[PDB]
Design a protein around this nucleic acid. Structure first.
Length: 51
RNA sequence: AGGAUCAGGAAUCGUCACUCUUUGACUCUUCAAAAGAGCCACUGAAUCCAACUUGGUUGAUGAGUCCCAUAACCUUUGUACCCAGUGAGAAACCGUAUGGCGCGAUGAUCUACCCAUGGGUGGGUACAAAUGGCAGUCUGACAAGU
């Protein structure tokens, strides 16, 4: 029952909340960073694959 | 006799690298513009819209994970302290000719206010804890190549 954008930021949601209430920007990777495919990119390309 | 111009005192190396600093050049480049050896043609490259293509709301792009929401800073409720230390002072006899726990340094003795040495209030300091505060659960439509 959790949507795709919550599969992203499931673990490290502080900077998500710093982005929600303070006018900041969310993480892109989240708990999905340490998965076996996000790090298989390089650089900024590792951002979008987190979606 | 003491001082300053033209023997009381270290300095004779045919360089290899490495690092650092220094300035100068340099492709540029902001202050900030302004001037343009000018025009044609050929040819090349690049950019931008239209176009088309491929991929995409079964989610394209945009994005402060890590500065740790795994927190910081408090806030309330249960405990440990101190304005651990203090250190010499605490209580008045004796089984069948003779034998001892009868204290005590090797420790006796204690753990800012009112109430006659019974109880506690007040502040600092520390932690455990919070489904407590501070403190309110991402976007969503183009993207990219020629």
């Amino acid at each position: 029952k959790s949507p795709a954008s919550t599969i992203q930021i499931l673990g490290a949601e502080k900077a998500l909340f710093r982005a929600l209430k303070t006018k900041h920007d969310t993480p892109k990777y989240g708990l999905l960073y340490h998965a076996s495919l996000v790090g298989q990119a390089t650089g900024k390309n590792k951002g979008k694959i987190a979606r």
